[PDB]
Design an enzyme around this catalytic site. Structure first.
Site, mmCIF file in Angstrom:
data_model
loop_
_atom_site.group_PDB
_atom_site.id
_atom_site.type_symbol
_atom_site.label_atom_id
_atom_site.label_comp_id
_atom_site.label_asym_id
_atom_site.label_seq_id
_atom_site.Cartn_x
_atom_site.Cartn_y
_atom_site.Cartn_z
ATOM 1 N NE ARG A 291 -4.159 -1.728 2.183
ATOM 2 C CZ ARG A 291 -4.155 -2.756 3.048
ATOM 3 N NH1 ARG A 291 -2.983 -3.033 3.788
ATOM 4 N NH2 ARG A 291 -5.090 -3.855 2.576
ATOM 5 C CE1 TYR B 87 -6.410 -0.854 -7.069
ATOM 6 C CE2 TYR B 87 -6.238 -3.145 -8.119
ATOM 7 C CZ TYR B 87 -6.325 -2.410 -6.970
ATOM 8 O OH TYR B 87 -6.152 -2.999 -5.902
ATOM 9 C CE1 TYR C 174 -1.934 -2.145 -4.990
ATOM 10 C CE2 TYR C 174 -3.092 -1.185 -6.632
ATOM 11 C CZ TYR C 174 -3.047 -1.068 -5.270
ATOM 12 O OH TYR C 174 -3.784 -0.280 -4.449
#
Ligand SMILES: [Fe+3]
Ligand SMILES: [Mg+2]
Ligand SMILES: [Mg+2]
Ligand SMILES: [Mg+2]
Ligand SMILES: [Mg+2]
Lengths: 196, 211
Positions: B56, B72, B76
């Site tokens: 995170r 999105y 990551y």
């Protein structure tokens, strides 16, 4: 000024990361393939729908689900990654619950499925906490004036599901019939179950 | 960290790109999209190289304009790659060589984090609490809209977890705390400028004080 950094295509970068780790023996055989299968086939809002249909038809399970969500979900074997501590939140004739992760995408994966693109959108993350009635309205859900909207921001380890109100016209329906009308959006809280 | 990722309450965004029950398509819309989560789990569960909290935080550490223009799943990919480089497992050179071009990463951390608070209070359902008026440059699981605000405890968790402000930096002093569902009136958070009822934030014990 304010320009994007130069970047290789995202697919090339993602596979580069895989190959760099895999080439060093750090990724077990079939590992990412196994996760892909879990994400696609096991983690599913059909599981949350099953839980809702059970709660709707079984007062004892309903009370367990609302007091110890983790234990209720464990009975079905649906605990999992990003779904180890579960709290179900009850809609009522005066209360509509809605779930978001304003800081990223936190979602009860095993019982809701991985979050949809829209839930992870900056639009949803920014707006639903501040103007949930307008957001739901725009999405196609009108919440009556006499209903409080409560937004749960998923900021720690609690993972949420909404227990929606059971709609009129479903009296006597089987669990399978009830499951069918409990959609992913009903579990997130942006939709109300619809009766044909 | 008061970064652009702390989006709750930001004004100016348009419509959510969805109508209820619309077809959202397959779980993954491209053949690489399962990789960031799967390799996160490799890092966390198989290698023990980092925590989920560190993932995170490394995403929060994307350069702000970079964060705002990146889809999105790609955030990551960038975040996990960054952690692998910071932990000395991979080099940026090999990532770029394999990628065949630039692979910019998240920015270095500007905070070493902080330990789990020494002085906290066990709160009970119904008690009024205020969110500590504190500013944390590293990882924190408190959205700014609730800083300094008052609400009521609706739940104390029956489990405890490491303090994010510590474990999000890979520190050894994260301890364990329960979290609390704190219910705030919409007007407490946004004054007259909200159409909501209440907002419930799941807050670590160390973020709270008696009201
Ligand atoms: Fe999240
Ligand atoms: Mg009935
Ligand atoms: Mg029948
Ligand atoms: Mg801010
Ligand atoms: Mg792009």
């Amino acid at each position: 000024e304010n320009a994007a950094p130069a970047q290789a295509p995202v697919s090339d970068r993602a596979w580069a990361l895989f190959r760099a780790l895999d080439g060093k023996g750090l990724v077990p055989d079939g590992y990412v393939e196994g996760w892909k299968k879990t994400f696609e086939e096991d983690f599913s809002p059909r599981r949350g729908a099953e839980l809702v249909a059970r709660a709707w038809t079984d007062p004892e399970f309903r009370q367990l689900l609302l007091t110890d969500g983790t234990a209720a979900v464990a009975q079905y074997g649906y605990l999992g990654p990003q779904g180890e501590y579960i709290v179900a939140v009850e809609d009522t004739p005066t209360l509509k619950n809605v779930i978001v992760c304003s800081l990223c995408s936190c979602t009860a994966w095993p019982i809701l499925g991985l979050p949809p693109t829209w839930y992870k959108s900056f639009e949803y993350r920014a707006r639903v906490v501040r103007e949930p009635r307008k957001v739901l309205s725009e999405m196609g859900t009108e919440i009556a004036s006499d209903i409080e909207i409560r937004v749960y921001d998923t900021t720690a380890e609690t993972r949420y599901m909404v227990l929606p109100q059971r709609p009129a016209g479903t009296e006597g329906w089987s669990q399978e019939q009830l499951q069918e009308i409990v959609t992913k959006d009903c579990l997130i809280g942006v939709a109300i179950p619809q009766v044909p | 960290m008061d970064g652009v990722h702390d989006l709750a309450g930001v004004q100016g965004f348009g419509k959510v790109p969805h109508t209820v029950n619309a077809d959202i398509g397959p779980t993954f819309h491209a053949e690489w999209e399962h990789l960031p989560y799967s390799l996160m789990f490799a890092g966390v569960a198989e290698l023990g190289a980092f925590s989920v909290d560190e993932v995170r935080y490394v995403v929060e550490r994307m350069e702000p304009r970079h964060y705002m223009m990146t889809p999105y799943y790609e955030r990551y990919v960038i975040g996990v790659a960054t952690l692998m480089v910071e932990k000395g497992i991979l080099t940026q050179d090999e990532l770029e060589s394999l990628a065949g071009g630039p692979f910019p990463l998240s920015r270095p951390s500007e905070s070493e984090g902080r330990p789990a608070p020494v002085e906290t209070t066990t709160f009970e359902v119904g008690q009024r609490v205020r969110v500590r008026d504190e500013y944390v440059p590293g990882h924190i699981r408190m959205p700014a809209y609730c800083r300094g605000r008052v609400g009521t405890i609706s739940h104390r968790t029956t489990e405890k977890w490491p303090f994010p402000d510590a474990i999000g930096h890979g520190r050894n002093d994260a301890g364990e705390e329960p979290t609390y569902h704190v219910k705030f009136a919409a007007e407490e958070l946004f004054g007259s400028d909200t159409d909501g009822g209440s907002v419930v934030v799941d807050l670590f014990e160390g973020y709270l004080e008696p009201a």
